[PDB]
Amino acid sequence: GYXXXXXX
Amino acid sequence: AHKSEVAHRFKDLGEENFKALVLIAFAQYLQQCPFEDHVKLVNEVTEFAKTCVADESAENCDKSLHTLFGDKLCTVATLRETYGEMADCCAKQEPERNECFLQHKDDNPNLPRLVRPEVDVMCTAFHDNEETFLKKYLYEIARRHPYFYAPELLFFAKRYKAAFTECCQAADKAACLLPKLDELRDEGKASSAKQRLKCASLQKFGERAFKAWAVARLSQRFPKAEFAEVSKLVTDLTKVHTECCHGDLLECADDRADLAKYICENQDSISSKLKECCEKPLLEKSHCIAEVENDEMPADLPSLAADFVESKDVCKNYAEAKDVFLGMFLYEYARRHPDYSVVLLLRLAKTYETTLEKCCAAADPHECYAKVFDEFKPLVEEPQNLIKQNCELFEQLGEYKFQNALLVRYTKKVPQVSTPTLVEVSRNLGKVGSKCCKHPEAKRMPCAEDYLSVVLNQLCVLHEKTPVSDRVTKCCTESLVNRRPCFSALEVDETYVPKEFNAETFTFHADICTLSEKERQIKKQTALVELVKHKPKATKEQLKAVMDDFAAFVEKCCKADDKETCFAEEGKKLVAASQAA
Numbered sequence A: 001g002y003x004x005x006x007x008x
Numbered sequence B: 001a002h003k004s005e006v007a008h009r010f011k012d013l014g015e016e017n018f019k020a021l022v023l024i025a026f027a028q029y030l031q032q033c034p035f036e037d038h039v040k041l042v043n044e045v046t047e048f049a050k051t052c053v054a055d056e057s058a059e060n061c062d063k064s065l066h067t068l069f070g071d072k073l074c075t076v077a078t079l080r081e082t083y084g085e086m087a088d089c090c091a092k093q094e095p096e097r098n099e100c101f102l103q104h105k106d107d108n109p110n111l112p113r114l115v116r117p118e119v120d121v122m123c124t125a126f127h128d129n130e131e132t133f134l135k136k137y138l139y140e141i142a143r144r145h146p147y148f149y150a151p152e153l154l155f156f157a158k159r160y161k162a163a164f165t166e167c168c169q170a171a172d173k174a175a176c177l178l179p180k181l182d183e184l185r186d187e188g189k190a191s192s193a194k195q196r197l198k199c200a201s202l203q204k205f206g207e208r209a210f211k212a213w214a215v216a217r218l219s220q221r222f223p224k225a226e227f228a229e230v231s232k233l234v235t236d237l238t239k240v241h242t243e244c245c246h247g248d249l250l251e252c253a254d255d256r257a258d259l260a261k262y263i264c265e266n267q268d269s270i271s272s273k274l275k276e277c278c279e280k281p282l283l284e285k286s287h288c289i290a291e292v293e294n295d296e297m298p299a300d301l302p303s304l305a306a307d308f309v310e311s312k313d314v315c316k317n318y319a320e321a322k323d324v325f326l327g328m329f330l331y332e333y334a335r336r337h338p339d340y341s342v343v344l345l346l347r348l349a350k351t352y353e354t355t356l357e358k359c360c361a362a363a364d365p366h367e368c369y370a371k372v373f374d375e376f377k378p379l380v381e382e383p384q385n386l387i388k389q390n391c392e393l394f395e396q397l398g399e400y401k402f403q404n405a406l407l408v409r410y411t412k413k414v415p416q417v418s419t420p421t422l423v424e425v426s427r428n429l430g431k432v433g434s435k436c437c438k439h440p441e442a443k444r445m446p447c448a449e450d451y452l453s454v455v456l457n458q459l460c461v462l463h464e465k466t467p468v469s470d471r472v473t474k475c476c477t478e479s480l481v482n483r484r485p486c487f488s489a490l491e492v493d494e495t496y497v498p499k500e501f502n503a504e505t506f507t508f509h510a511d512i513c514t515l516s517e518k519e520r521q522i523k524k525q526t527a528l529v530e531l532v533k534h535k536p537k538a539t540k541e542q543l544k545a546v547m548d549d550f551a552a553f554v555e556k557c558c559k560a561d562d563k564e565t566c567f568a569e570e571g572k573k574l575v576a577a578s579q580a581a
Helices: B005-029 B035-054 B065-077 B085-090 B096-104 B119-128 B130-144 B150-167 B173-205 B207-221 B227-245 B249-265 B282-290 B305-310 B314-320 B322-335 B342-359 B365-369 B372-413 B419-436 B441-465 B470-477 B483-489 B510-514 B517-534 B540-558 B565-580
Strands: none
Touching: B005 B035, B005 B065, B005 B130, B005 B150, B005 B249, B035 B065, B035 B130, B065 B085, B065 B096, B085 B096, B119 B130, B119 B150, B119 B173, B130 B150, B150 B173, B150 B249, B150 B282, B173 B207, B173 B227, B173 B441, B207 B227, B207 B322, B207 B342, B227 B249, B227 B322, B249 B282, B305 B322, B305 B372, B314 B322, B314 B342, B314 B365, B322 B342, B342 B365, B342 B372, B342 B441, B372 B419, B372 B441, B372 B483, B372 B517, B372 B540, B419 B441, B419 B517, B441 B470, B441 B483, B470 B483, B510 B540, B517 B540, B540 B565
């Protein structure tokens, strides 16, 4: 990944 | 296959228990961070966990609990405090980082007293916002008791909530609620001290020591169980406490439930007393099981002499599996003796082990270990006479004056100890009176010596922080199992130089008449300690006379409501009279 959001 | 640990734990525990356990896990380490900070992080963790229950491939879900917990603790703890002990831990990588956290739980933190508002204010708050009211209950507790058994804390939380749900629909709200609350408070303090002993044992004496303790207690409780069953439970029970004492709250809560579930599924192989426990809901189930009565022991158990003393093969059978052989011996001795304290059983097993190590190395081992049970008689009579003598003392004295007796005794034993600490330990030692002397003597020793183990462990934990008494350090470090006899054996410290007479210590004001009964006795007991530190040779008789004059003086000045000059004048008159003895 790395990234993040919160999705959810 | 559970590619995401957080989702696994969330599914096993349910959203409600998970949110609560997370809040606990952070507050026990981050004890000085304010309430709102913990609220915010709890919500973020929940948001994240819910994310993963849906899609396990989402960001960061395949990471470990240690890595996740570490990362989150560090960014929270360093936000305001950029350099600190947690800053040091956070320069480490896993796994050294997770272990570094262990030293950053403060045991008796500098934290304000918790003062309850009016009954009416509490219930409006409880009605006006339930979730926050209850989280504040968890937060304020976890941070003051960083070693609280987390699954048990959830249980208290259930009972705290239930108290409010009942008592604020009630016709006399305060007469309903305050008794329910004060009992939880006292139970919570007693629960927390029990775990602190578990964690201290595990840390200062090792897994093996804890496992021995567990084999003893579970064999007394479940005497019909086969030895291999006890060993399984001991192993699971030890994994549970290792996980909570090292901060892995989600894992130890899940693993405690599985343990309750196992036990209820195997009642027949374990005990006949678990039937009511096992019909209760999840949190009460685990609580009930750990409090359950001893089962009857099986009918015609042979004496241990055949297998462990008279056989010529003791040494060969010991060497094939020493921990199994001693475990069996402990199991056999414990299951036949519910009337012995656990620490005494451990004391007995350690004596047996010591004898075998010595005897199996000597020329004729059989003639050497033949007498080993004769060594147990003195070890059994010592505590039996301690309890009997002290219960007689408590019977005529009551809890308050019984505490004063133990106050003088331990002040003369370890005068180097700070007065506040001496007052607290002595007050807690004195609660064995109410707690244990009512039971028939056939159950007194386990009640008493096991409770005293908890109290002394608090003394050791307090003292280690700021050490001043070499004798205290020796008694705490030399043997977990022998702490209580080590202290009882202490003679009066005749090397101690008396404290100089300072007239302010023994001056008292009318401000003592406004205090709660508990806070007034502590001030009276502080003075008794400082008197003994001033004249350590004063006799039990002379000190009783003074404390009776003192209590008179204090109650003979509260009823006065004069210019309160009663303390200044009648008090210097009390000091002349005390000098008379």
